[PDB]
Design a protein around this nucleic acid. Structure first.
Length: 1134
DNA sequence: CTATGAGTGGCCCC
DNA sequence: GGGGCCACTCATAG
RNA sequence: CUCUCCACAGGUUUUAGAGCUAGAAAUAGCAAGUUAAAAUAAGGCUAGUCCGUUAUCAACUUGAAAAAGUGGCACCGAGUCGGUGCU
């Protein structure tokens, strides 16, 4: 008989539960054949289990690393270009100079030339370092001196500028006009006034440059600037913005009434993510305010760095850094004198001990500036004459280096100016500098446009550039080889996000005019008004909505309910008293783009004319797509006949960011067949119905739902490769879905290839997508009428049903005991789903469920994965006399140069061969696990025998090489199991099966004061907990027995037992909350540390893999029902 | 008598 | 989080 | 929610920046310290101002791979599954 059955599933991010049940909710048990060379021919297993795997990773880290690699390659290429230019003239001076520069890294033994790179003789090196203690002294010398200079020094300065050319955020020629502190402060005030028109700040008469750039501490400058603004507080939003500009860490919680703390700091690398999180909670209308704050911060940092402005010169940065060097020298001398005079004992700890956070650790060690200031602050306060030193420490200017993290704000125009000054002064003596000045300036300033991408000949999957010819792309002929227009067109066709509602179309910009109209009309659709004499609230009519928009939304950036009441209902419709529902204080929608374009173009008729909609949409799209001003001008050049020069100039400067959620074809592209109206047309006026956006797409009376269903293409989703990205979700859930489909395939295989009646899936639109994926792969029958035959029905259930089922019928869930709960959730999902389907014998069902939940044999499978990723840790360690350091190059011996350490093992291979041991070089047969690291994987797979022979293994048996990826399972005596974490470490592999009564007791005792139910039920549960306190002893006894049997952690187990007796009088709730922590000792996976009351139990690591070389290797399928057991003790025998 | 492997504790991770 | 590595002490064993 | 591009500032590593005096040496005292070069996943051939950390992967047979194929059923029970019966 064909047993009708269903497959229940519980898809997660790290686990994929699965279970097979019959019509009676019983999980069948079948006897499975076991292959391999062991005596166990057959094993009986229950058809229930769970699959565990590592979480999926997103491509963010790989993308960052790839971008970094490209940056490094292109910087190397710039230096190569400069050396190519200088190559001809350098040979006449010192031909080996470029070789000596390249070989500076090597030790004296590996150097082919003289060890001094610049001049090659020690006298000239000493003279150079005495005359130019830093590179900035040389830079100032070249900028200022008219005398003929040495060509090597010119190359050094030019290469130092080109290699560290600074940021590109400031756009266009010039710089001092954009760098005004006053200008950006005025812009910030204007932005704040625009966002907070009700509370304008009068910034007139405020000398922002004098206050913000003065030599005071950050808090003092903040307070001084606030004091000049009447009515303002240092705790206000503007005060917090100024503090953020000055480099402090203000809290925005009070200014936005947020639940959690909102602290931002521009110096932190995570500023972008925190700002995105803050904007997602406060709204994206404040992005311009934070951009203005960042710009003001950059201006402040530049004014702090380029202190020297009075003296007439053309290299301000060089003079500023020389000034910092002089200040550091003076303060160091003063500090040495004072410390020697007053604290002779601490002189060594400050100036000699590199392990401390003193000056010695600040310079020769790894101490940063913050740690150095922390270490030096208390010492100065204990000494006399340190007033000025304390002031500088409060200013963060004491003993300050030149190459610090502050230099991230210096524009590339300053470096370009210094480069131009050098090239102008020194070209009189060296003709090739004069002939190549433009080339060097281009090499410094040329930046590959972000819309051209990698410059590949097709052999890169990331490239979209189109080539006019086949010449090599250099900074000087980029424009002649690359077609910038075609590249931009390809970049638009590739980048733009596809709409989710209509997959083929492209979403509109978030600031698009049509999008703003759509939002305004959607919000106005559900507005109700109540006037005197009206029995029920009424919706706004189409003419009413149009009048409201024209009178308020086209005149005010933000419109509130009170404004509507006093401006439209009263002034226009003569309603003295009106009540409005659906909007509390203000409308979220706003015609911000409309107001900006009215400010720029200054033609309201042009904006309100529907004939001009396409032009405005294209202008907004062009502004949102691109950032380079050349493209912005080029694309807008088609509209030059419609606007004057000033309007076009103002349009060129306006920029937009972000994309919306809906496409133009969805809103105003598709039309209802019966009426011809779009979604926007119905939003403007729908008569008495007044349907909103969601209603329009779901109303069966309109063709919108049919068109959405037709345009959207039901695809394979996951389980078809290169088509998974078509689905929408995190990569981890995609991995879970793929594993789920594989599990379903193997389960159908096991049960005699009869497809299940039902497939209950549990994890919303992603669940539905999974549903049609499994439906498509399940049903393969087409009738003559083309209707699908529903042999398999996929049902999706909410987790709340299962939660109520657990809490109501005492099938309590405790996560910490073991990983059995995944399979149990899957089984309960299946039971509930089948019950509801049968709707559309309580005692027997309850007994069956309780019996199934108490089964100790559950097929937990840990998915074996061949590790990939970084070769080793990214820290470069100092040289050591150790053989575990990895060379960074082929010819860089780690004993001399240091290098990477801690490589990651891809997989281990069992090696049966003979190795020479001892000084006698005697051949001895050995059998061990050898770890094949990720770096060596390709070489191993290319020729395993040669790779093993290179490691000293001789007489290698090729047939006995066994591939053992991570989490390979070995079975040892008394059922003890260990999973291979790496070639030199193991993991726990056994699962504790507590009886259900202990699980219920622990669940009730842990939530003793947190039960959610009727008071009588809570009293009953408390009484039950108090009655069965002796279960604590039984739980401890079972933990001890299981540990002694399979864990073998005698020391830690004794510690736990001793601590248990110590706190036996503790409250029962605390005892349960602490015992639940004890199961970290027995949980599957890597050992972990845990706290039992006040006692911390350190983790027990299994650092020996010799014990598994004589155990039973188990190859488990994805479900674990099919397995092949290999007894390694029979391999390698004599 | 000294060279070799075996476990335990602690530090470390752009 | 969890695997790698080093220093110290212990067992081994020619 | 996901994917992609262009740049910046650091940081680490080795070398260069002549250490002096008293002392046979161990060592003690003193002087100095702020910068630069090179590398930043080993490398690869398709030789590009390209690619190299995402995704996928139990065992056996066919293959280069994609990919395909390989493992009887019913009942009574449960400490990681056991027993009984038919084929």
């Amino acid at each position: 008989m064909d047993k009708k059955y269903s497959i229940g599933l519980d898809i997660g991010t790290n686990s994929v539960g699965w279970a097979v049940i019959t019509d009676e909710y019983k999980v069948p048990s079948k006897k499975f054949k076991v292959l391999g060379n062991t005596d166990r021919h057959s094993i009986k297993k229950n058809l229930i289990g769970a699959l565990l795997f590592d979480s999926g990773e997103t491509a963010e880290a790989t993308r960052l690393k790839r971008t970094a690699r490209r940056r490094y390659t292109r910087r190397k290429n710039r230096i190569c270009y400069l050396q190519e230019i200088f190559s001809n003239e350098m040979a006449k001076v010192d031909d080996s100079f470029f070789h000596r520069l390249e070989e500076s890294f090597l030790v004296e033994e590996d150097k082919k030339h003289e060890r001094h790179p610049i001049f090659g003789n020690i006298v000239d090196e000493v003279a150079y370092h005495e005359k130019y203690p830093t590179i900035y002294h040389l830079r100032k010398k070249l900028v200022d001196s008219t005398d003929k200079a040495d060509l090597r020094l010119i190359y050094l300065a030019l290469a130092h500028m080109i290699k560290f050319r600074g940021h590109f955020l400031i756009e266009g020629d010039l710089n001092p006009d954009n760098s005004d502190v006053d200008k950006l402060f005025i812009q910030l005030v204007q932005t704040y006034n625009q966002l907070f028109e009700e509370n304008p700040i009068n910034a007139s008469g405020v000398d922002a440059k004098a206050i913000l750039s003065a030599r005071l501490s950050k808090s003092r400058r903040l307070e001084n600037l606030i004091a000049q603004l009447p009515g303002e507080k240092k705790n206000g939003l503007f005060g917090n913005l100024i503090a953020l500009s000055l480099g402090l860490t203000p809290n925005f919680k009070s200014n936005f009434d947020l639940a959690e703390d909102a602290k931002l700091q521009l110096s932190k690398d995570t500023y972008d993510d925190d700002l995105d999180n803050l904007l997602a909670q406060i709204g994206d209308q404040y992005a311009d305010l934070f951009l203005a704050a960042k710009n003001l911060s950059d201006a402040i940092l530049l004014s702090d760095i380029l202190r020297v402005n009075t003296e007439i010169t053309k290299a301000p940065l060089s003079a500023s850094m020389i000034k910092r060097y002089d200040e550091h020298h003076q303060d160091l001398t003063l500090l040495k004198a004072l410390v020697r005079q007053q604290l002779p004992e601490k002189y060594k700890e400050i100036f000699f001990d590199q392990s401390k956070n003193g000056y010695a650790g600040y310079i020769d060690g790894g101490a940063s500036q913050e740690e150095f200031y922390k270490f030096i602050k208390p010492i100065l306060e204990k000494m006399d004459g340190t007033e000025e030193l304390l002031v500088k420490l409060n200013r963060e200017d004491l003993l300050r280096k030149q190459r610090t993290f502050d230099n991230g704000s210096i524009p590339h125009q300053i470096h370009l100016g210094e480069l131009h000054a050098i090239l102008r002064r020194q070209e009189d003596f060296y003709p090739f500098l004069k002939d190549n000045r433009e080339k060097i300036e281009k090499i410094l300033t040329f930046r590959i446009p972000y819309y051209v991408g990698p410059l590949a000949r097709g052999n890169s999957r990331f490239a979209w550039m189109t080539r006019k010819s086949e010449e090599t792309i250099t900074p000087w002929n980029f424009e002649e080889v690359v077609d910038k227009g075609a590249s931009a067109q390809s970049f638009i066709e590739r980048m733009t996000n596809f709409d989710k509602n209509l997959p083929n179309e492209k979403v509109l910009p978030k600031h698009s005019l049509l999008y703003e109209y759509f939002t305004v009309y959607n919000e106005l659709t559900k507005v109700k008004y109540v006037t005197e004499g009206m029995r029920k609230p009424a919706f706004l009519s189409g003419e009413q909505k149009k009048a409201i928009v024209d009178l308020l939304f086209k005149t005010n950036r933000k419109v509130t309910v009170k404004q509507l009441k006093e401006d439209y209902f009263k002034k226009i419709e003569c309603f003295d008293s009106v009540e409005i529902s659906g909007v509390e204080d203000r409308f979220n929608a706003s015609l911000g783009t409309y107001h900006d374009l009215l400010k720029i173009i200054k033609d309201k008729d042009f904006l309100d004319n529907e004939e001009n909609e396409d032009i405005l949409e294209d202008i907004v799209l062009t502004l949102t797509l691109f950032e380079d001003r050349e493209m912005i001008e080029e694309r807008l050049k088609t509209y030059a006949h419609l606007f004057d020069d000033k309007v076009m100039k103002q349009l060129k400067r306006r920029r937009y960011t972000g994309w919306g959620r809906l496409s133009r074809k969805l809103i105003n592209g598709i039309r209802d067949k019966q009426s011809g109206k779009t979604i926007l047309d119905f939003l403007k006026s729908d008569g008495f119905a007044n349907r909103n956006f969601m209603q329009l797409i779901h109303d069966d009376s309109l063709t919108f739902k049919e068109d959405i269903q037709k345009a959207q293409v039901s695809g394979q989703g996951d389980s078809l490769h290169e088509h998974i990205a078509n689905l929408a979700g995190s990569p981890a859930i995609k991995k879970g879905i793929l594993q789920t489909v594989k599990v379903v395939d193997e389960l159908v295989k096991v049960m005699g290839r009869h497809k299940p009646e039902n497939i209950v899936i549990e994890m919303r639109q992603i669940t539905k997508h999974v549903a049609q994926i499994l439906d498509s792969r399940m049903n393969t029958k087409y009738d003559e009428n083309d209707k699908l035959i529903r042999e398999v029905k996929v049902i999706t259930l909410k987790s709340k049903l299962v939660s109520d089922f657990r809490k109501d019928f005492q099938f309590y869930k405790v996560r910490e005991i073991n990983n059995y709960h995944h399979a149990h959730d899957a089984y309960l999902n299946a039971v509930v789903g089948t019950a509801l389907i049968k709707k559309y014998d309580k005692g027997r069902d309850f007994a069956t469920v309780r019996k199934v939940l108490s089964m100790p044999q559950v097929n937990i499978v840990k998915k074996t994965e061949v590790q990939t990723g970084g070769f080793s840790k990214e820290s470069i360690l100092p040289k050591r006399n150790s053989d575990k350091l990895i060379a960074r190059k082929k010819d860089w011996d780690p004993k001399k140069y240091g290098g990477f350490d801690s490589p990651t093992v891809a997989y281990s291979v069992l090696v049966v061969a003979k190795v020479e041991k001892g000084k006698s070089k005697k051949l001895k047969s050995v059998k061990e696990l050898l770890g094949i690291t990720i770096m060596e994987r390709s070489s191993f797979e290319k020729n395993p025998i040669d790779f093993l022979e290179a490691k000293g293994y001789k007489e290698v048996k090729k047939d006995l090489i066994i591939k053992l990826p991570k989490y390979s399972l070995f079975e040892l005596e008394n059922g003890r199991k260990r999973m291979l974490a790496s070639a030199g470490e193991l993991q726990k592999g056994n699962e504790l099966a507590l009886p259900s009564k202990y699980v219920n007791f622990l669940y009730l005792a842990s939530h003793y004061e947190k039960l959610k139910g009727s008071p009588e039920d809570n009293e009953q549960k408390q009484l039950f907990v108090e009655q069965h306190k002796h279960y604590l002893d039984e739980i401890i006894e079972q933990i001890s027995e299981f540990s002694k049997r399979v864990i073998l952690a005698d020391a830690n187990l004794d510690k736990v037992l001793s601590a248990y007796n110590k706190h036996r009088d503790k409250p029962i709730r605390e005892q349960a909350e602490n015992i639940i922590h004890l199961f970290t000792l027995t949980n599957l996976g890597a050992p972990a540390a845990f706290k039992y009351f006040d006692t911390t139990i350190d983790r027990k690591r299994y650092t020996s893999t010799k014990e598994v070389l004589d155990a039973t290797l188990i190859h488990q399928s994805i479900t674990g029902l099919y397995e092949t057991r290999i007894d390694l003790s029979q391999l390698g025998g004599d």
